[PDB]
Amino acid sequence: GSGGLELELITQPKKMLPELMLQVAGRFHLELQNHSAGRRFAFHPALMAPIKSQILWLLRQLA
Amino acid sequence: AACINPQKIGAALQKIDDWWANDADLPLRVHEYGANHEALTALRHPATGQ
Amino acid sequence: PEPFADEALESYFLRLSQENGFERYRIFSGSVQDWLHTTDHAAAGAFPLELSRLNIFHASRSSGLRVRALQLVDRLTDGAPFRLLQLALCHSAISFGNHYKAVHRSGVDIPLSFIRVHQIPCCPDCLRESAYVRQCWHFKPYVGCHRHGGRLIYSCPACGESLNYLASESINHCQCGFDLRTPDEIQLSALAYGCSFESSNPLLAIGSLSARFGALYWYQQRYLSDHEAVRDDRALTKAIGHFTAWPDAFWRELQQMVDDALVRQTKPLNHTDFVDVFGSVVADCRQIPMRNTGQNFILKNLIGFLTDLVARHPQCRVANVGDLLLSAVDAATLLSTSVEQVRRLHHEGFLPLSIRPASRNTVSPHRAVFHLRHVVELRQARMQSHH
Amino acid sequence: VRPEPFADEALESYFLRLSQENGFERYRIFSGSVQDWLHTTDHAAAGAFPLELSRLNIFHASRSSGLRVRALQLVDRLTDGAPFRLLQLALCHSAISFGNHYKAVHRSGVDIPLSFIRVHQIPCCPDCLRESAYVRQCWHFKPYVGCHRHGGRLIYSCPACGESLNYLASESINHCQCGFDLRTAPDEIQLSALAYGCSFESSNPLLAIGSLSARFGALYWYQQRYLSDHEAVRDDRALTKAIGHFTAWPDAFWRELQQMVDDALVRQTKPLNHTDFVDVFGSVVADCRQIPMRNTGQNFILKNLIGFLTDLVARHPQCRVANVGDLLLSAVDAATLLSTSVEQVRRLHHEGFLPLSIVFHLRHVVELRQARMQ
Amino acid sequence: TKIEIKTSLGSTYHIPDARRLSWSGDWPELEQKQLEQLTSEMAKALSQPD
């Protein structure tokens, strides 16, 4: 015991977290896009489901 | 009065691209990437070198 | 000892040990495992002694080392490199539908579930002529026999003591018992050992054995939903009669559910999933392992039907049946081709996509997106072959 | 209002007869009417039905064939008394064209390689036309020189006067445009005329195959390898060349193969174990993929090549110096000779059936084939 | 549908009925001819200045 989504959406109830999966995955690709090495990987079709699945798992674990 | 927009007349006139894939079919509206709106695709996608 | 044309791998080995006088357990362990060890250590490490465990489809990963052991025998017994390997049961490279395990023996693949693992029966009327446990007994769908006056394979409780040949390795007699020299449809069910038919009017009466096996597996899940009661004979015995009017019954089964589905409709049909009406009958077509239409007769009839269905329902102002959505994996099945080929076919513009996806996303194989009438027409137009 | 249908005629012929029986004078007037009729129910279908006869057939349309078929079904339906689909009367693209083996068109169970389709002129036969004047389908296939009935010799490309015949172009069945009535006025040509219905008597030659698609496959292979047409148009050469080739075959095939590899030794400048199988055999193995059947009992070209290769290696066992049999094959080539897949060959390497030369030697493949695959 | 065209060089073109002309095919006589004449005026408009 402000206002930015990466701060407010986590402050919310843990049960809600699984529904943020697509947003997290989005940010993830963007973070790669902004990196010197990640320009070869970001938004590549091959990594789509892998990244999304592992994130979804993590969120469920957090929930 | 009722009308048809300028570029809508224009889009019809310039539809004369049938130089791809050795299959004439019907022509596409000239576009740098070969866009096809009806099928939601692109015939001269950069991945092909065309 | 020479192998029989129809002999099981375990039968030959049991005979071999005995022929050389290696009758007892200890010498069975010895004449087998220790000799192998002394050739090389790998031939033994991969080789457990108990008989049931010896076959490949019981094995794990180190199969090649077990094979080496078979190759040592091939030299010792004056053989040929594949003399024994033509008899062994191995892991099929073919899934046989829905990722099932299936087992391969020199050209015929039989689903894991039809292997009669326990309680092998026998037929005294053939055992008296050449005593060796024979193949085609290990099959679940096989009661009775061809020839010998027919009747039943003499079953496990010969004399108040359950029998088999693997936990107790004798052929003529077993344990406490004696030398065992002890309703007119099953003789047709019996024909999984071979086909041999003429005047084959039913769609189940022709073809290679793998197809004949697949057809039965399909029938069973679909109509024998009752839990297993080891009615191994009676449960399957009925499948042949069932197919005798097939060319005219299958369609009615499909028609019935078009109407029952229709009256429960909640959305306009052009946003309805194909699956909501037909209940995956399409996916089941994948349980027969063959891909082409001329051999996989179940798929052949389903397509026949769908073509007619579309033909009597042409396009108009209000949507109707035939505008249902298929997913990528469904077109692949109806078009008799792998999924990647459908993606290539989309990319060249031979068929339209009906649902607009969001950006920075992808449409997965399971998503429903092509109209039925578009797939049926394209197939007639450019997918035919001599098959 | 339909006419008698026949089982042996081309779609275009049916349409001409159909329109005439309805009091239409010219095809263009009839097709004009039809294209307009369709605009009352389906505008996309209507846009798929061309006015000129020469392009009516399905095989002509690249990505709009989908709509074209639909249009044909509507015609069947609107014309009264329609127990029979006209879709059984026309060419479609065939599925075997993947991988560019060759292009082929399908009709009711037989695939026809595309190169055997006539284009600019159409022969016909007067002893058949007087009995029933409609155009037979078989007349569109080049191999069909000579009629199989009525003697049938020397079928013309020019009926009379100064003009060749093309019935699609001039839109006419009984008469040519100069007014000649087409209906008024060696012995072995029959060995090809019979391609019509196969129907051969038992004989010694390799071309005694009952599968029609394979019979065409065989003719195509021969044309592609010997009747190269570097120098000429081949109107009927096959009739005097193919029959012999596939009759002296027990030797002729071995002589060619035996000469080819001996000839190869003469020019074998490089140490033989670094030479490819293809460097000596000229991809005759890849050509074995042109016949549409995969089983040994129909694909006799591959069957005879195995014979030859088995003896070739058998006379040349392993020694200290590179020799015949030490040529290299890919997994794809071994898979072809072994009648298996590539991954199965990889498994055979992985399980120790055969070793890698760096990719397999021909002796390795023949030995593995004789040893494990019977 | 009837289509009439006039130009600044003094030409007039007349298609009595536009419903029958395809992308691919041979146009009927006297119509094929006006396509050639119009093609020529435009070929110049596209290639020579002033």
Tell me whether residues C360 and A43 touch, CB distance under 8 A.
yes
Spatial separation of the C-alpha atoms in residues C339 and C332, rounded to whole Å? 5
CA distances to C46, C64, D236 from C13, in Å = 17, 19, 64
- Compute the half-sphere exposure of residue D58: CA atoms within 13 Å on the CB side of its CA: 28
**Rg (chain A; Cα; Å):** 13
- The closest alpha carbon to D115, from D240, D244, D229, belongs to D229
Helix (H) or strand (E) run with residue C108 in it? strand C108-111
- The closest alpha carbon to D207, from D237, D238, D236, D245, belongs to D245
Spatial separation of the C-alpha atoms in residues D214 and D198, rounded to whole Å? 11
N- to C-terminal Cα separation, chain A = 20
Spatial separation of the C-alpha atoms in residues D146 and D157, rounded to whole Å? 12
C43, C49, C51, C53 alpha-carbon torsion, rounded to 10°: -70
AA letter at D152: G
- The closest alpha carbon to C386, from C280, C292, C283, C266, belongs to C292
Partner chains of C (3+ C-beta pairs under 8 Å) = A, B, D
Task: Please state whether at least 3 CB pairs lie below 8 Å between chains D and A.
Answer: no
Nearest CA in chain C to D96: C385
Spatial separation of the C-alpha atoms in residues C170 and C190, rounded to whole Å? 25
Residue by residue, DSSP assigns D239-279 as HHHHHHHTTSHHHHHHHHHHHHHHHHHHT--S-GGGSBHHH
CA distances to D276, D277, D353 from D361, in Å = 9, 9, 13
Helix axes C250-262, C297-311, angle to 10 degrees: 50
Spatial separation of the C-alpha atoms in residues C102 and C109, rounded to whole Å? 6
Q: Does C362 touch chain D (CB under 8 A)?
A: no
Contact call for residues D293 and D214 (beta carbons, < 8 A) = yes
Spatial separation of the C-alpha atoms in residues D196 and D211, rounded to whole Å? 12
Listed resolution, Å: 3.5
Q: Is the dihedral of CA D40, D42, D43, D45 positive or negative?
A: negative
Q: Assign residue D199 a region (left: φ > 0; alpha: ψ between -120 and 50; beta: otherwise).
A: left
Spatial separation of the C-alpha atoms in residues A32 and D21, rounded to whole Å? 72
For residue C338, what is the DSSP state?
-
Tell me whether residues A26 and C360 touch, CB distance under 8 A.
yes
Q: What is the 3-state secondary structure (H, E, C) of chain A?
A: CCCCHHHHHHHCCHHHHHHHHHHHHHHHHHHHHCCCCHHHCCCCHHHHHHHHHHHHHHHHHHC
The residues near A38 (Cβ < 8 Å, ≥ 6 apart) are: A31, A32
AA letter at C268: P
- Mapped onto helix, strand or coil, the DSSP state of residue D143 is coil
Helix (H) or strand (E) run with residue D366 in it? helix D362-372
- Mapped onto helix, strand or coil, the DSSP state of residue C53 is helix
Contacts of C351 in chain D (CB under 8 A): 66
Spatial separation of the C-alpha atoms in residues C75 and B47, rounded to whole Å? 57
**Rg (chain E; Cα; Å):** 12
Contact call for residues D111 and D79 (beta carbons, < 8 A) = no
Beta bridge partners of D276: D328
Contacts of C360 in chain A (CB under 8 A): 26, 29, 43
Query: Best interface-test mutation with B: which of C342, C348, C369 has the largest number of B CBs within 10 A?
Result: C348
CB atoms closer than 10 angstroms to residue E38:
14
Spatial separation of the C-alpha atoms in residues D138 and D10, rounded to whole Å? 9
Task: Please state whether at least 3 CB pairs lie below 8 Å between chains B and A.
Answer: no
Query: Best interface-test mutation with B: which of E5, E23, E35 has the largest number of B CBs within 10 A?
Result: E23
- The closest alpha carbon to C293, from C351, C337, C345, belongs to C337
Nearest CA in chain E to B27: E23
- List, in sequence order, every beta strand (DSSP E) within chain D: 92-93, 104-107, 110-113, 328-329, 360-361
CB atoms closer than 10 angstroms to residue A30:
14
- Compute the half-sphere exposure of residue C254: CA atoms within 13 Å on the CB side of its CA: 21
Q: Does C353 touch chain B (CB under 8 A)?
A: yes
Please count the residue pairs, one from chain D and one from chain E, whose beta carbons lie less than 8 angstroms apart. Answer: 7
Contacts of B50 in chain C (CB under 8 A): none
Helix axes D65-78, D27-38, angle to 10 degrees: 100
Report the largest interatomic distance among the alpha carbons of chain E, rounded to a whole angstrom: 36
Calculate how close chain B gets to E27, using CA atoms only, in Å: 17
Q: How many residues does chain D have?
A: 374
The residues near C326 (Cβ < 8 Å, ≥ 6 apart) are: C274, C334, C368, C369, C370, C371, C372, C375
Partner chains of A (3+ C-beta pairs under 8 Å) = C
Tell me whether residues C362 and A48 touch, CB distance under 8 A.
yes
Calculate how close chain B gets to C319, using CA atoms only, in Å: 20
Q: Does B24 touch chain D (CB under 8 A)?
A: yes
Contact call for residues C383 and C335 (beta carbons, < 8 A) = yes
- Cβ burial, residue D297 (10 Å; 0-12/13-18/19+): exposed
Task: Please state whether at least 3 CB pairs lie below 8 Å between chains A and C.
Answer: yes
Q: Assign residue D81 a region (left: φ > 0; alpha: ψ between -120 and 50; beta: otherwise).
A: left
Task: Please state whether at least 3 CB pairs lie below 8 Å between chains E and C.
Answer: no
Spatial separation of the C-alpha atoms in residues D352 and B48, rounded to whole Å? 42
N- to C-terminal Cα separation, chain C = 45
Spatial separation of the C-alpha atoms in residues C179 and C127, rounded to whole Å? 10
Q: Does D50 touch chain E (CB under 8 A)?
A: yes
Tell me whether residues C364 and A26 touch, CB distance under 8 A.
no
Q: Is the dihedral of CA C162, C163, C167, C173 positive or negative?
A: positive
